[PDB]
Amino acid sequence: MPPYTVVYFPVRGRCAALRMLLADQGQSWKEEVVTVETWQEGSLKASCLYGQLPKFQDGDLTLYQSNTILRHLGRTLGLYGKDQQEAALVDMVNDGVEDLRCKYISLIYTNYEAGKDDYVKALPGQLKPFETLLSQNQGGKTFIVGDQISFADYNLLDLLLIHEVLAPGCLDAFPLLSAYVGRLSARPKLKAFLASPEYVNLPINGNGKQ
Amino acid sequence: PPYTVVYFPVRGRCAALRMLLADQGQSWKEEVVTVETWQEGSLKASCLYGQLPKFQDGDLTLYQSNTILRHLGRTLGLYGKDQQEAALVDMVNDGVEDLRCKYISLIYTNYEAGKDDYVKALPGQLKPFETLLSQNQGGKTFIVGDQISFADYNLLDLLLIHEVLAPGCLDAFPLLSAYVGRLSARPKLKAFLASPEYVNLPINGNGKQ
Numbered sequence: 001m002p003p004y005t006v007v008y009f010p011v012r013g014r015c016a017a018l019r020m021l022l023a024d025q026g027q028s029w030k031e032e033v034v035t036v037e038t039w040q041e042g043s044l045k046a047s048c049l050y051g052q053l054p055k056f057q058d059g060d061l062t063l064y065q066s067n068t069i070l071r072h073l074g075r076t077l078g079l080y081g082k083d084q085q086e087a088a089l090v091d092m093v094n095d096g097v098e099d100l101r102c103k104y105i106s107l108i109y110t111n112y113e114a115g116k117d118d119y120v121k122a123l124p125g126q127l128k129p130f131e132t133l134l135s136q137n138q139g140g141k142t143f144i145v146g147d148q149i150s151f152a153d154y155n156l157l158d159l160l161l162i163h164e165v166l167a168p169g170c171l172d173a174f175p176l177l178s179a180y181v182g183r184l185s186a187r188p189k190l191k192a193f194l195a196s197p198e199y200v201n202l203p204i205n206g207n208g209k210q
Numbered sequence: 211p212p213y214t215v216v217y218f219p220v221r222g223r224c225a226a227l228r229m230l231l232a233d234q235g236q237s238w239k240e241e242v243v244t245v246e247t248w249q250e251g252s253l254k255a256s257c258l259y260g261q262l263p264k265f266q267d268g269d270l271t272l273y274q275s276n277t278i279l280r281h282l283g284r285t286l287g288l289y290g291k292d293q294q295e296a297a298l299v300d301m302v303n304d305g306v307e308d309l310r311c312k313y314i315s316l317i318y319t320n321y322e323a324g325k326d327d328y329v330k331a332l333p334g335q336l337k338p339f340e341t342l343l344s345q346n347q348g349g350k351t352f353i354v355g356d357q358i359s360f361a362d363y364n365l366l367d368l369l370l371i372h373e374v375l376a377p378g379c380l381d382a383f384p385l386l387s388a389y390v391g392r393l394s395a396r397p398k399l400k401a402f403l404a405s406p407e408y409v410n411l412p413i414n415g416n417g418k419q
């Protein structure tokens with residue numbers, strides 16, 4: 001059996017980035033799907049540390065919190081910068097990605113109809129920091145931090161992909177981020193994963209909105 | 211080092227990192243940002259995500275409170291003994307961050323009408339931390355492993371501000387209760403928590419708590 005197990009609802013959501021990471025790094029993992037019906041049962045939810053998913057297993061290590069899973073995999077697979085200084089920059093990027101993801105999730109699940117217009121208008125200002133970071137790192141020709149891929153790249157990549165769906169052409173204003181999405185998405189293992197049913201046949205979110 | 215904390219005159223998202231620096235015997239400077247300065251626009255525009263705190267470690271400039279905590283945890287050896295513990299430390303910190311976000315939402319956007327439901331839901335929000343303690347050396351040491359981590363400081367702050375919001379919220383949790391008393395008694399931290407540097411700052415920026 002695989003050493004890694006992802007326990008989550010049948011959506012990309014907060015597991016999209018970690019899955020891209022696993023696939024691109026040639027890692028093996030199992031998908032344990034939890035249906036909304038099974039979740040309503042209460043048993044599993046009550047057993048979850050913070051009463052939520054994703055839940056992740058690495059051998060007998062049981063983790064919760066999507067960013068905890070990303071950092072754990074980043075640590076173990078060498079995707080956390082070349083030194084302590086870079087590790088901090090990677091965290092700074094991931095925390096920024098998380099802040100915007102939280103806003104994105106809030107829109108999708110609690111106020112889509114009445115908040116989309118404002119969200120899209122504010123989007124450029126929210127994406128600009130990442131374009132700025134790319135511009136300050138090798139002209140944005142490599143990764144978000146340093147000269148090697150990090151877990152933050154996978155999280156940012158997902159953030160960009162879902163926003164292109166939410167607001168088509170949103171990266172027209174950000175040449176480096178646009179090229180970055182195309183470049184990372186072309187990586188052999190990641191490219192195959194992104195085109196596979198395992199990824200394509202899952203909705204981005206669980207409420208039919210995107 | 212040297213360390214510089216750039217923030218508004220409140221405890222807020224710098225409380226935990228300050229407790230960490232003080233408890234670890236580190237020296238740092240406080241750059242207090244005024245309303246005029248922030249409204250002026252220049253400083254804000256220069257911040258990566260347009261927000262504070264901003265942190266200086268020598269020639270390294272950081273933003274994001276949890277990035278600062280993890281950086282100090284990494285460089286000062288407050289991140290568990292190995293990868294397994296580091297993951298648990300992250301799990302705790304992310305849990306603390308989630309509740310802090312809910313707390314922030316309450317304080318700044320729905321205090322009057324939302325306090326009732328928030329306090330009613332609080333016990334269920336704190337229980338996970340009691341459970342974590344119960345599974346680590348009977349809760350007699352730290353939140354993860356046998357050494358203090360950056361998550362301990364963040365959790366400690368979370369618990370302190372909730373005791374203000376809802377007095378007695380830890381009475382049902384013996385491990386958390388003893389944990390707060392134990393951590394708060396650490397010499398350097400005790401002195402810091404009793405100093406006006408800490409005491410004379412409001413918890414939040416809108417006078418609510």
Ligand SMILES: N[C@@H](CCC(=O)N[C@@H](CSN=O)C(=O)NCC(=O)[O-])C(=O)[O-]
Pocket residue numbers: 013014045051052053054064065066067105304308
């Ligand atoms: N800070 C946590 C959040 C986990 C979370 O919000 N999980 C949701 C599904 S993903 N939603 O955007 C969840 O488990 N919802 C069910 C419930 O809350 O009962 C994380 O894993 O990043």
Ligand SMILES: N[C@@H](CCC(=O)N[C@@H](CSN=O)C(=O)NCC(=O)[O-])C(=O)[O-]
Pocket residue numbers: 099222223254260261262263273274275276314
């Ligand atoms: N995710 C960030 C949030 C930083 C933040 O919210 N900063 C606020 C002050 S603390 N508020 O609860 C801030 O800089 N507000 C001024 C503004 O946003 O113009 C962090 O540092 O954790």
Ligand SMILES: [Ca+2]
Pocket residue numbers: 286287288289357358
């Ligand atoms: Ca240590």
